[PDB]
C-alpha cells in the first residue's frame, strides 16, 4: 500500500514535508549535471504507474531544462524537449516515458524512464518486446510519448476534429481534389 | 474556388477496377484461409439513432452479453464460432432483445460445429 | 532515375521477382473443401455448390440468378 500512500503524498505538493524534500533536492540536482543518470527512481509510485520495472534494462535519467518562452510559445512541451535530450544522450535506448520531479524558478526537472531494447531480459519478456520492435525508434522525437499525444491533441470528440488522426493528414484529405472516372 | 494548389493536391482514381479485383482476391484469400467458414462474422440487428432514420434498422457491431446469454451462446465461445461481441451496447428494450436473440437462434439452428480435432 | 539508367547501362543481371503472393487464393490440403474447390470458379459459386453461405451480412449488390451463398 506504500505506493498509494506515496500517491497521496505526491498529490499534496506544498505540504511541509514535500516542500522541504523538494527544496533540498532541487539544490542537489542543480549542483549535479544538467543530464545525469538516476539509479533509484525519486518518485517510485509515479515510475511504477508510468511503466517502470526493477528489471535489468530499465534506467532513469533526470534532466533539467530552462523554462520560459521563445512572446512566442514553443508548440512542444518542456517535458518533450527534456525527453528528446535524454534520448539523444542515451541513443541506444528507447524513451518509455517521463515525469515531473521538481520545478525551481529557473529550470524544470524531469525523470525519464528508458528501456534497453537489445537486452536479453527485455527481449524475452513480452509487453516490452513491442518497444524492442523497430517501429518505435525515437518516439520522443516523433511525438509518440504521452507529452507528444497531449501536444498533438489525440483525443476523440467534436472539440478535436482537426487534430485526431493527424492534423496535416486531415488538412490534405480536406484539400485534395477527388476526380472519379465517371463524373 | 482554386485559391490553393489543387494541382499539387489532385487525385485521379484510374485504379478503380484494379482496386476492385484486389479486394475480390483478398476476399478469396480470406475464404481460402477460412474454407468452411463464411468469411464474415454475424452482426446484430440495431436501430439507427436519429429521428430521421429511427424507422429503419441496420447491422450493428456485435451482440450484447445478456442477449448472448438469453440465446444460450457462451461469451468466450461466441467469437470462436464467429459471432461478433460488443460489450458497450445495451439493450434497453425487450424489442431489440427479442430481435437479436431470434437472430442468434437462427444462427444456432443453421450452424454446423466441428468436433474440435 | 539515375539508378534506373545505371542498371540499364551495366552488365549486371536484372533480378526478376517471381509473382509470389503473401496469401493463398485457393484452399489446399486433403479435406472436403480442398478436393471440391474449383480453381476457375468464384467464392460465391464454390460456396453455392457446397451448399454453404459466404456472407453473413445483407447483400450490397445484385447477386447471380442462382446465387445461394449471400444471405
Amino acid at each position: 500500500g506504500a505506493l498509494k500512500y506515496l500517491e497521496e503524498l505526491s498529490k499534496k505538493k506544498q505540504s511541509d514535508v514535500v516542500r522541504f524534500l523538494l527544496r533540498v533536492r532541487c539544490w542537489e540536482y542543480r549542483q549535479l549535471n544538467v543530464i545525469h543518470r538516476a539509479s533509484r527512481p525519486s518518485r517510485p509510485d509515479k515510475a511504477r504507474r508510468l511503466g517502470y520495472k526493477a528489471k535489468q534494462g530499465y534506467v532513469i535519467y533526470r534532466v533539467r531544462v530552462r523554462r520560459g518562452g521563445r512572446q512566442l510559445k514553443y508548440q512542444r512541451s518542456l517535458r518533450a524537449t527534456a525527453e528528446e535530450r535524454v534520448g539523444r544522450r542515451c541513443s541506444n535506448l528507447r524513451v518509455l516515458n517521463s515525469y515531473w520531479v521538481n520545478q525551481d524558478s529557473t529550470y524544470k526537472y524531469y525523470e525519464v524512464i528508458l528501456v534497453d531494447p537489445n537486452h536479453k531480459a527485455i527481449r524475452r519478456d513480452p509487453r516490452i518486446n513491442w518497444i524492442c520492435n523497430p517501429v518505435h525508434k525515437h518516439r520522443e522525437c516523433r511525438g509518440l510519448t504521452s507529452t507528444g499525444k497531449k501536444s498533438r491533441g489525440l483525443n476523440k470528440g467534436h472539440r478535436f476534429n482537426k487534430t485526431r488522426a493527424g492534423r496535416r493528414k486531415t488538412w490534405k484529405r480536406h484539400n485534395t481534389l477527388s476526380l472519379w472516372r465517371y463524373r | 474556388h482554386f485559391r490553393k494548389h489543387w494541382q499539387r493536391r489532385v487525385r485521379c482514381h484510374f485504379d478503380q477496377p484494379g482496386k476492385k479485383v484486389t479486394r475480390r482476391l483478398a476476399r478469396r484469400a480470406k475464404a481460402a484461409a477460412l474454407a468452411p467458414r463464411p468469411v464474415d462474422k454475424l452482426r446484430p440487428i440495431v436501430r439507427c439513432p436519429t429521428v430521421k432514420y429511427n424507422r429503419r434498422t441496420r447491422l450493428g457491431r456485435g451482440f450484447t452479453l445478456e442477449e448472448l446469454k438469453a440465446a444460450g451462446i457462451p461469451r468466450l465461445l461466441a467469437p470462436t464460432i464467429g459471432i461478433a461481441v460488443d460489450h458497450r451496447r445495451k439493450n434497453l428494450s425487450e424489442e431489440s432483445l427479442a430481435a437479436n436473440v431470434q437472430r442468434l437462434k437462427d444462427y444456432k439452428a443453421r450452424l454446423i460445429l466441428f468436433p474440435r480435432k | 532515375r539515375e539508378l534506373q539508367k545505371r542498371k540499364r547501362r551495366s552488365s549486371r543481371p536484372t533480378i526478376r521477382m517471381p509473382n509470389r503472393r503473401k496469401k493463398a487464393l485457393n484452399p489446399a490440403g486433403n479435406n472436403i473443401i480442398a478436393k471440391s474447390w474449383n480453381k476457375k470458379e468464384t467464392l460465391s459459386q464454390n460456396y453455392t455448390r457446397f451448399g454453404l453461405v459466404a456472407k453473413l451480412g445483407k447483400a450490397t449488390g445484385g447477386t447471380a440468378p442462382g446465387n445461394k451463398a449471400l444471405l
Binding site: - | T80, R110, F114 | G51
Partner: peptide, 21 residues
Amino acid sequence: VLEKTKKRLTHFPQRKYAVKA
C-alpha cells in the same frame, strides 16, 4: 506469448464451423 493468453488460446481456440444455406 503471455501465459494468460496461452491459457485462453488453449481452452478457447478458433473452432471450425460451417453455416448452411
